[model samples]
Target: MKLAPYILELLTSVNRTNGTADLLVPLLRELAKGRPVSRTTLAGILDWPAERVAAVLEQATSTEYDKDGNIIGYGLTLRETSYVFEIDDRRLYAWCALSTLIFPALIGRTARVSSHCAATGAPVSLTVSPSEIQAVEPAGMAVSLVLPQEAADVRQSFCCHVHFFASVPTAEDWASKHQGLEGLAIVSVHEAFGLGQEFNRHLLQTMS
Candidate 1:
């Protein structure tokens, strides 16, 4: 919870500001495409000088890179997060459940998501509209809701990597079975999307 609120503050605060979103939004799109971005490549995408990119990166609300300095995560999830976003001729990964919803709206792209039931490991798929979700194939689905573990080690592996599931029972069951995941919660897809929407509302209000 502390971690979620803390990162939520950073995520909302940075993107709602003037110059930061210009950098974050496009960077998010690139991460969504399942590619690791280097500093030089991101600079080209933003058309900013290397110095500016470095400066902006210092304040990046969300960024993850490997020891080799390759980008791995941004707003969504680690390159390893369970949700995957696929569009025509492109396959990408998302960081979390809500991120799968957020990207379509930001990028104005129709996409498909493939994930699994946290409890059952059954396949779950959905079609996304730019502003909404449609055609969840398995139906009656929910997502895993993990409050972040504050410490960096625990935090990275814990609830921050919230994932999608085929059902609420399945998601809740996942928490029950996993050792350190006992407190994990469940949010239906609709509820999770609305929560994400409120975050967007906060950003817009801050911008206003």
Candidate 2:
């Protein structure tokens, strides 16, 4: 399947043109610590002015905030999700199956990922490092993808539909029954990792 267009479309849905990449890369790493990241803390980490951080946050539609107005979730989250991502003993979660695959590369850390098949509820697990996917438990595991729809919230528009499946056949079966997932494709884990790497390369290039 042609993935370049889909990757570009997906990035467009998540990032707006107001220096989001500069903020997003660090914000995601901070969130991976499994704690709510206050704007002040993020400002300190980014070494940017608080107003700059706040401005980026204001433009970010998918960012989740805590009661104290600290950031609790972005793509990687402190909240519960179907995809669990563990790094350095911190148990975090991902917004979708693809996030679990891509985050390690984005954050430059290794992650032990665990989730259940969206179709069968059977367990799925993998080890994702910055360079590669080290292991996949089921051997035949696949990831479901959908062409993102235009919506105000990326989580609702894209993430909610992307999921892990035990196999390609199971993914196809699940996709057949789901409405609104028009271009759903079940790809092997290796292909998914390649997509993630390509997406990251393009995303980070914007930082320079």
Candidate 3:
């Protein structure tokens, strides 16, 4: 698959970084994707204190799950609930594409692109070191792994109007190459927008 819409603006920022955000920023937009999730484990992922997490849960529009026992999570029932970006601070509910969620973090890390030949029969790879990892979330959330910025103080939204486009082209051929992980593309990029599974399948088929 290709980079979906709202990708460019998704990867950019206006905070002091000057239209740029670090790549290694720990980001999780909690879209309420699949079925109802558990309370404690799900809360743990957010890094929020249990009591605070519980408070937020109390105020949030949530839904209880019945399929599993002793479960607690919130969102639209059996549907694609987008927990995009702005819903936290400004109380603004805006739309953001999945591809855009991870553009900045992936791009911030220099992706060394290379391909393999018949001698080894390998796929493309994009590799990088920890030095390359920047603690910056492209989604423009309250949390910033790289710098200290409060949720309300940081004034900017990761939307099409705010972000511009980049020249980097991530096609199936260029993106789908796991056996040869030249870079951390699958995790930082694909998982950001849900586009790495089939690519992995292609890599598996190629390897076999």
Candidate 4:
């Protein structure tokens, strides 16, 4: 099944009216630094009023914060997950497999991504730059895609199901087990990266 339309629709659904779209890049950049980002620090980075930053944060229910109210995870996070993304010396995690492909462009850095095939636990690794996917181990690697349910939490509904597979055979095997689910598709890593590029382009446009 074609994944482009679903990717577009899902990303477009993200809340943008309250400047959350504008904050996304910088917020992810801060989170990628391997430190919990306090709202005050984010405000300082943007030269925005702390209250203004807090207002956006309040509307952004998806962001994960620490006990001290410091932001720990957004799309790119300090929290460990299946998808590990490393940039420079900082190691980070992604909310989903797609995030690992898309975030390098948004954050303006190259990333070394490592994850395991959801079907067989085989390793999957890639190097992604803002402009291209530089390399991928297990060249046949693929990714799974599913459209999020309406009004559902994205992490639970979508991210949790998206994963890397060692190859199309493994991806298809996993999809078979999830039979009867609508909008489920398996795509090559190159296809997934292309989807990510388009998603990032739209996101950048939203910020403008």
Candidate 5:
């Protein structure tokens, strides 16, 4: 239950943005530090459940909106999170879905980025299965699960991942081809039976 450097870096970065920050590289990076953080640590600090550490971290690091349009992990400025990236090198310029891949393919650019789950470099696996949640119940760095309703694809499942500055189509474009697509979801790699990397891969598998 040590503080993973990944988690620390993520929290610190996100703290910077809203005075803000995923994927595999983090696990390896944090583990290399080799400090044993206990689950009780958060409870001692936040006076809350230590189990919720991962969930809260994931949401805080990734989540962008609430019903009121309040955005976390984005800092004080409402700088558009949406990006347009090139797929060639997966370089990010703006965060638009359609602009990715197409920019490089059609316009012959380098890389592309989308504002979807994949763009964040944190993959997601959303299914309308029994697990389809209603609201996000985050506890800590782990045990983060939420009820996703925004873009639930009742028919086809969604397994989305980010390629750093990867590109994805506009919601409209992606949805046009893919039915029952959901919007960016607030989930945690902790959901994958506690193993972050394996679980994130599982999410991306659904998309493929």
Candidate 6:
């Protein structure tokens, strides 16, 4: 699976304090179980003060913990993205098309996702497993990489995180019209997941 260098950077690059890293996976597991956690409870579990937990969260911009402390978003995933995940009566959302397709593997769970083609508003759905992806409708789809003009604005751009269209042609057309997206590229979902898998492998290797 071939991916652009920048896409690989997006996947592997992160900025998390050690304190944040220590709590990340556990938090993800809790969220995966389809329940919201209060910051107070989390603080006690991590053996940290409430203010310390808040400070860690402040550094993780992608994590959307609400005013009341319910986590509404995590890396490459939001409660309001295009792809909908129905698991154990929980309706969740991912940050991007690739996230919807790959997070099942990351969390070791199955998911039923319903989404749409970016260009046509055509419905797209899938049942994703830890090892395979079963496309239910419009099985052939590609995601777009709409680059940000300013590097600093990249993280804030919706296109920087997740964008999907029915095909590469449509993605190209869209990018052509959008300013500062002259180098946008599209890749199939399978290839995108492969890139993610390889990136994960790289991380594990580096850590070990």
lDDT of each: 0.66, 0.87, 0.27, 0.85, 0.27, 0.63
- The CA lDDT at 189 in model 5 is 23
Give the alpha carbon lDDT tens digit for every residue of 110-186 in model 4. 99999999999988999999998867889999999888664666678778888999999889988998976668899
lDDT per residue as tens, model 2, 86-169: 999999999999999889988999999999999999999999999988779898899988887655577887788888999888
Give the Cα-based TM-score of candidate 3 against the true structure: 0.22
Question: Of 2 and 3, which scores higher on lDDT?
Answer: 2
Clashing pairs in 6: 77-95
Sum up the clashes in candidate 4.
Answer: 0
Off by over 4 Å in 6: 1-4, 11-13, 19-21, 43-52, 76-78, 146-155, 158-161, 203-208
- In angstroms, the error of model 4 at 141 is 0.4
Q: What does candidate 3's lDDT look like per residue over 17-99, in tens digits?
A: 31112101211123222233455654466555556544444432232345573232221123222322222131211222222
Q: Model 4 misses residue 23 by how many Å?
A: 0.5
Judging by TM-score against the true structure, name the best candidate: 2
Estimated TM-score for each candidate: 0.72, 0.95, 0.22, 0.94, 0.20, 0.78
The weakest ten consecutive residues by lDDT in model 6 span 146-155
> In terms of TM-score, how similar is model 6 to the real structure?
0.78
Error of 1 at 36 (Å): 5.1
Ranking by lDDT: 2, 4, 1, 6, 5, 3
Residues 105-205, candidate 5: write the lDDT tens digits: 22222221233243234332211111222221111111211122223321112112211221223222323443332332222323322323333333334
Model 2, which residues run further than 4 Å from truth?
none
Q: Candidate 5, which ten residues in sequence have the lowest lDDT sum? A: 154-163
> Model 1, stretches more than 4 Å misplaced?
1-20, 31-41, 44-47, 58-73, 76-81, 149-161, 177-183, 204-208
Model 1: lDDT equals 0.66
Error of 6 at 42 (Å): 3.7
Q: Where in model 4 is the C-alpha error above 4 Å?
A: none
Name the better of 5 and 6 by TM-score.
Answer: 6
